[PDB]
Design a protein around this ligand. Structure first.
Ligand code: NAD
Ligand code: NAD
Ligand code: NAD
Ligand code: NAD
Lengths: 317, 317, 317, 317
């Protein structure tokens, strides 16, 4: 018969609460806000529940500390993390958050092993790989939100330069969600017009493109330094919801995200940011961009960065 | 000539940021997030800006500490407040927030005097009255968000009892935004059916109605007790957005809010929670509910409660 | 796993095409446009398909003359009808459309017996009863769209008098979808305010209320006389989509529609317009309005009107 | 001061009615449906008005035969045309529709000369040029809907090949709205990946690309051959709405439409399909695609084809 869609949000902090808010507002699914901290998810769920009638949504949103409540979830979005913002690298959270995901993996494997898992917890790419390993869930049913956020920033900065609608900018960021991420300028277009043409027309310079690439890479610090007590959470929540939409509505949407890449980009099995097709069977395919030799090299360096952090985790305390 | 609609959010804390988020997502308007605290409004605006392309919105969202930036605002929403949740009474914030709203009133008077002003800062009804005095804005262009939140909770709790969609519940809360708020059970209907019929049908007891009424009055504590930093903010943000919508889209919408009532409900000039008609000229009308003798009495007590706290403010030692 | 929602529209004429258009635009489901007339559904589906990318929807919409294509449909909406608008009574289509529904019943019973069936074909109430009888589908899984259209008109005319947002008018029409339909003025409210109060305030007269009741009853002719070559189709399509939403999203929405009423309104088993709760198990409940003796009588006359047309069909050629 | 946005739809046939429907549903604006035929625009407006409460929209929709009613319109959309589908060429309607647009131009010049005008009437590119001449409106406030429809079909057919979401396909059709329209395969990307890469990857053949290009050019016939009354109307309506949105919400959106190109693409003053930037000042910019030699040649032929039919109109015998 018909059953309501169900999204479980593991971690009801800044990002987690926003996901429930937006999911409830859109009436995409029922939401289960999970957290180990007492009160937090219950208070947020009640608050969000009062807003549902205002939004004309019948989504049910509840708070809990019981993994039994995530039973039958179609999608699980993992935001759970140790406290304290990274000082200057997402990898500072590696050891703690790895242990958290061990716990989350057991809850998911027990109560909703057929769920599509979207990881957000940093260090993103290594956390996704660690989760798939420990949970044993199929590779196509486990991925990480990152590329949608990085590319959205990349697109937005390009859009803000030209003064155009950012939806009409096509632009991807690939590789690991770190300093090594690769905003692929070579495949950027604005309504079909490539950046090379705008350079010739004198409407953008290569230095401005380089500033935009740098800005994209360091964007997390710009937001964090202004917020003071945490990291970005409005956009990361929105990005996760877009990914959830792609799965639940079987969109076959092109989603840059951390997925298990084995026969593309010259890698033989690793979680990293790539353009994917997402539908009812999770990550259904990976697209291969035309990268320049410089971009292929930068990707290689990003791959090394992911492997480095991955090897550190293997030799953790 | 077409100009983008512009909404100023004065105070970029919990509620402020959510307003900017939702307004941006809906592409209702451009947003200026104002706050005295450094970084905070700039951080949230940047984060929210990155989500705009994800939502398919071209809304601009910026942060600032300069009232000149709210120039030409169509709507101004005031969340500015001193920190810390009230222990068990919204009046505790009286003098601090009154001083805050003085500077806000000066900012609005100078830079966007023709704007529609929606006050949220507690103690709500008194703050609205105070802002209008100091600012000198027309009574119909100044009002308070409260009734939509309180009525939404009332509707939600009624809907939860019958197991029906809350959107199909008509229910109003009137009077001041405090313990003396009056959920008008006499005017409640569920798809056309009044509570009296549900009693006779044995689908609800007067006891259950009394529990719902009480639950509405103290709903703020239930949320605040669980959050453990501050008070409700997801639903208050949404309520303010609905009010902004009614103005910007000239809905002629029935909106329970704190408005200047000078004839109806046996009062000659006071700001209190009443069902209004909001459109392009602000609060365009006030509707007279058919209140019972009991409800008239409870409303009278709320009027006194509001006049008390107002009188305390007028006597600045 | 996740499967896309699927709505089958049986009859791809004026109403049928609009349903697919709106369902596709909202991305509520995939749509199968069925018609026996060659070309029509194929042409409409291709046209609507080109619009999907404009709406940002991934809904698939196809045209067909093969009942196999409606296999696994969650909802079936029946608009199929003999040609030529009713001269002055919906019952003129009774004999022809009854035979059409015999055919439709066989397709549904074979290819999607677990579907929620929403009938639109006139004469609505008798056609719904005839379909349930011939198809053998459970009473709660078969209903007729009518009350949403009639009540929407009723609400709109009231709203247009007062100059208010029609969403803030609560008003029901019950009984059969014919001249005998009963707009229940006694349970009408505008933001909680009953009509009796507006009469006292001099803002509406009982004659104006009577004009509105009459206008509601004869609304179909007003539209038809202006369109010339057919009957209303924009609003009837929208109404069917709202009903489909209620089922697919398990809203528990209050939906006036033609449902099998057996223990309410003093009837012991008949399809007629009543306020229902609609969710994932179809018509899940019926609400009992407080009718005046005059309204109870008018309902009785509507019931007799339905029985009369029903008995004519039993003694058809 | 807030005023409701206002859209005039001149011609209330197939496309006109759909525009009013969708505009109303989205609450983008109020609508005035204009037509010379009696009843038709009034019938559709009344029907559509009944759907407004169902959609939760307060948009007004009215019918009229009086140009005074389009006074103060922000946008004017012209679907007015002689009846009957073209047999196999849009130019067949040339002289009839040219005379129709004379009276429309007079109506707009008198009652809403500051409006943004979106022409739909075929033969599109010539009609746009003709309307601008007779009306005397600024070149940037007058344009034609075509590219959005043609590009949407192009995107749709590309997306259907790869089995991906069409929203993630960037693709442009330029030149005149006719057989000589140029689907620019060189500027096509799917999530950043160009067609050249898909060839090398063996995911598409040049033959399949040629079929898609051809399919785009003759797409109108495929629909028209199946409808058996008139031509496509669901997607053209939606395309016009997207253009209206871009203007009313100042999107700075990339919109392929028939615009006055006086420098780019080696032309000095002609209306043809080009990718524009649309915002509050109408057609604010034109983008230069990086066309191949072949595409430059095909575009040149389209320019000649457009100049031919334009020249035939200028010589009124
Ligand atoms: N991938 C990205 O692009 C991206 C972007 C921004 C932030 N992030 C990351 O997302 C994570 C969440 O960020 P945030 O701002 O929401 O953090 P937060 O501190 O606001 O929330 C974290 C929540 O997790 C909860 N938690 C802790 N241990 C838990 C456990 N064992 N099980 C369940 N819940 C637990 C905490 O109680 C807290 O409520 C962080 O690790 C951050 O670095 C990722
Ligand atoms: N009306 C209602 O129904 C309702 C519901 C919930 C909360 N509230 C009230 O709304 C207010 C805001 O709640 P919150 O959770 O957003 O509080 P918050 O502390 O999160 O945000 C308040 C913001 O105001 C800013 N501020 C302080 N002084 C200022 C000044 N002079 N000018 C501009 N900004 C200034 C602070 O920097 C802070 O960011 C509170 O007073 C709360 O009691 C009302
Ligand atoms: N319940 C209501 O409130 C309400 C409101 C308006 C109209 N209606 C009714 O809805 C029905 C449809 O109206 P319309 O304007 O869409 O009619 P229409 O003539 O535009 O469309 C009817 C379609 O049904 C098709 N058809 C005929 N026989 C069929 C069969 N055996 N199987 C499948 N399809 C078949 C026709 O080819 C045609 O395309 C009419 O009977 C009308 O009276 C009901
Ligand atoms: N640009 C495109 O891509 C595109 C796509 C499809 C169709 N079209 C064209 O758009 C036009 C409209 O298509 P349609 O299906 O809506 O046609 P239609 O015949 O359904 O509607 C045309 C309407 O114009 C009205 N009309 C006639 N003379 C008039 C006058 N002097 N003033 C005002 N109104 C008048 C008629 O009464 C009729 O209702 C056609 O010319 C068609 O070729 C263009």
């Amino acid at each position: 018969m018909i059953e309501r869609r169900k999204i479980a949000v593991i971690g009801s902090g800044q990002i987690g609460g926003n996901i429930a808010y937006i999911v409830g507002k859109d009436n995409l699914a029922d939401v289960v806000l999970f957290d180990i901290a007492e009160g937090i998810p219950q208070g947020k769920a009640l608050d969000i529940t009062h807003s549902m009638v205002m939004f004309g949504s019948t989504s049910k949103v509840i708070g809990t500390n019981d993994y039994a409540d995530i039973s039958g979830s179609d999608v699980v979005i993992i935001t759970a993390s140790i406290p304290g913002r990274p000082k200057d690298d997402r990898s500072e959270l590696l050891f703690g958050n790895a242990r958290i995901l061990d716990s989350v993996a057991e809850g998911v494997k027990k109560y909703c092993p057929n769920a599509f898992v979207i990881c957000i917890t940093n260090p993103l790419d290594v956390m996704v790989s660690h989760f798939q390993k420990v949970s044993g869930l199929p590779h196509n049913k486990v991925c990480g939100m990152a590329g949608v956020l990085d590319s959205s920033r990349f697109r937005t900065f390009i859009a803000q330069h030209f003064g155009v609608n950012a939806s009409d900018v096509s632009a991807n960021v690939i590789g690991g969600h770190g300093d090594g991420m690769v905003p692929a300028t070579s495949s950027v277009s604005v309504g079909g017009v490539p950046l090379s043409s705008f350079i010739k027309q004198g409407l953008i310079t290569q230095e401005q493109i380089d500033e935009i690439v740098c800005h994209t890479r360091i964007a997390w610090k710009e937001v964090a330094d202004n917020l003071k007590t945490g990291t970005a959470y409005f956009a990361p929540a929105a990005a996760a919801v877009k990914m959830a939409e792609a799965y639940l509505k079987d969109k076959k949407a092109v989603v840059p995200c951390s997925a298990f890449c084995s026969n593309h980009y010259g890698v033989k099995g690793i979680y990293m940011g790539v353009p994917t097709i997402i539908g009812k069977n999770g990550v259904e395919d990976i697209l291969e961009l035309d990268l320049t030799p410089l971009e292929q090299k930068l990707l290689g360096e990003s791959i090394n960065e992911v492997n480095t952090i991955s090897k550190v985790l293997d030799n953790a305390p």
